[PDB]
Amino acid sequence: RPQLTFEHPVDNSPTPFRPVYYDEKGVRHVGEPGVHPFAERIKAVSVPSEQLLLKTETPYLSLVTCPLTFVDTVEDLEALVAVLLNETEIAVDLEHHDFYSYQGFTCLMQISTRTQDFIVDCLKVRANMYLMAPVFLQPNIVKVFHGAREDVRWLQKDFGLYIVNLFDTSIALQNLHMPHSLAFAVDHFCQVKLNKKYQTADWRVRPIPAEMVSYAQQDTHFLLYVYDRLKQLLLNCNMLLHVFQESRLLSLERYEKPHLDPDVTYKQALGRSLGGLSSSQLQVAREIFNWRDMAAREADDSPSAVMHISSVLSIATKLPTSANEVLKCCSPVSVAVRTNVMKLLQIVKDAIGSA
């Protein structure tokens, strides 16, 4: 559980997200709920004019001789931040974990420059990621991401990081009316087939095995060449400025804590599976689901790690009236369920017979 190594424990309560963030001077600020703290700066920022010209592409380097650095200390992160400050464009991607965490957390950050690749250990330097704010806030540095919707949110949630002059290569492909996955872009422009196998891997594991180091590196390694090729296609249709505009709108999106609606969320997750239930089974479905979300917040686990969705329906349908019967419905039994089996049993007991 990486959370136990966190310098700051995660607040999972149903309270709007309040961002704590650092500026380019490394000064700490406390933001406001529902307010993106860099909204005024992003809306007042121009695209660097050199980025809007037709330029020859810089091809990706060889994976055999391209320098790759694994960054997992503060000093190595700071050294990396100064290297990035001498670039006009960098390619960024993130790896994330959502099963054994309520809100989820970023596990790894990958960065490529025209001359080298970097892999940042977000877990080991979680508390120090704010040091990247001069790079992410620098308007003269374009930050290239491929399909950044979740990334934009993750950077906020975990590190108080915000992107000034984001360029999203997936938005470029959508605007050119063409396929837009990362694997597609790399195969279309570079004729390289990306390894599918590690998209759903456990990015919390340390050490990272060689195959996963290679997977992480290859997600950014070809992105600046892809960026150059999409720029030429957009100027060949101002479609290039439109894509920078759409990407800026995406950078204005805000992270918001998972939203539990005690009157609605259960229906959204159980959908059609609520048909065939009596009024008391429906009451049990709702209360088990609302309990599952509360217990998920407390354990800092996703609701699925507390109890599978079918287990919620199983309790509702079967109406277990003993701890063992409740344990049968909940298989595979989590610690959260085993420790609170009497509470789940009380939920069922308060609903059987006449209401």
Do 290 and 248 lie in one domain? The reply is no
To one decimal, the resolution in angstroms is: 2.2
Mark whether 121 and 55 lie in a shared domain: yes
The number of folded domains in the chain is 2
Q: Which domain holds residue 59?
A: 1-262
Both tokens of 324, joined, read 């063992």
Beta bridge partners of 334: none
Q: What is the C-alpha to C-alpha distance for residues 75 and 286, in angstroms, rounded to an integer?
A: 50
**Half-sphere exposure at residue 18, Cβ-oriented, CA atoms within 13 angstroms:** 8
Q: Are 208 and 216 in contact (CB under 8 A)?
A: yes
Q: Phi and psi at residue 103, in whole multiples of 5°?
A: -85, -20
**Residues 186, 192, 197, CA angle at the centre, nearest 5°?**
90
3-state secondary structure 86-118: CCCEEEEEEEEECCCCCCCEEEEEEEECCCCEE
Q: Which of 228, 262, 296 is the last residue of a domain?
A: 262
Contact (CB, 8 A) for 114 and 84: no
Whether 51 and 147 map to the same domain: the answer is yes
Q: Which of 230, 262, 294 marks a domain boundary? A: 262
Check whether residue 257 and residue 274 sit in a common domain: no
Does 312 lie in the same domain as 221? no
Q: Note whether 276 and 165 are same-domain residues.
A: no
Domain termination site, one of 262, 294, 323: 262
- 236 and 277 inside one domain: no
Long-range contacts, 137-140 (Cβ 8 Å, 24+): 137/23, 137/24, 137/38, 137/41, 137/162, 137/164, 138/24, 138/85, 138/164, 138/165, 139/45, 139/46, 139/48, 139/164, 139/165, 140/48, 140/88, 140/165
Domain identity same for 201 and 220: yes
Looking at the structure, tell me whether residues 99 and 224 fall in a common domain. Answer: yes
The CATH number of residue 339's host domain is 1.10.150.80
Q: Could you tell me whether strands 89-97 and 105-112 are parallel, antiparallel, or unpaired per DSSP bridges?
A: antiparallel
CATH assignment at residue 197? 3.30.420.10
Length of the chain: 355
Q: 145 near 169, Cβ under 8 Å?
A: yes
Contacts of 179 (CB under 8 A, 6+ apart): 173, 188
User: In whole angstroms, what separates CA 264 from the centre of its chain?
Assistant: 24
Q: With contact defined as beta carbons under 8 Å apart, do 70 and 79 qualify?
A: no
- Cα–Cα dist 104/120, whole Å: 18
Q: Are residues 311 and 242 in the same domain?
A: no
Same domain, 156 and 174: yes
Residues 284, 270, single domain; the answer is yes
